[PDB]
Amino acid sequence: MADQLTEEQIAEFKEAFSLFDKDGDGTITTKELGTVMRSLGPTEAELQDMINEVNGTIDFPEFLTMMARKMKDTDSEEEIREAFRVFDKDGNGYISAAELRHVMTNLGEKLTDEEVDEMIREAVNYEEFVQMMTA
């Protein structure tokens, strides 16, 4: 979904897309698409794959959908690690197991006590626990 990209990222992508291309239609050549992607801040193989995925004309929603998959993963991983490690103040990232289970059962969402016990039995660093729960 396109809702993963923030408003600032969408605005910057639109600004670069409009600045690279001249006045007229938003269609941009595949080589020009790669040049604009390089000007916006990837490998040659990734650029070729993105050009083949999207004649030779690329419009704005196509560029947004292509960049969302590349910008979502690392940002989500970093945000998850930072948010999981934000509770404890020790700085090491490995909080108490009982405290982590109590925080997961009391705050977060709506889950039964049996489900929390099963998740604790299936499960300690915060980022490691988040990555294990995501998988």
Residue numbers in the entry: 1 to 41, 44 to 56, 61 to 129, 137 to 148
The authors write:
Ryanodine receptors (RyR) are >2-MDa membrane proteins that allow for the release of Ca2+ from the ER and SR, thus mediating a range of Ca2+-dependent processes. Each forms homotetrameric assemblies of ~5000 residue long subunits. Mutations in RyR1, the skeletal muscle isoform, can cause malignant hyperthermia (MH), central core disease (CCD), and other myopathies. Here, a collection of cryoEM structures provides insights into the molecular consequences of MHrelated RyR mutation R615C, and how apoCaM opens RyR1.
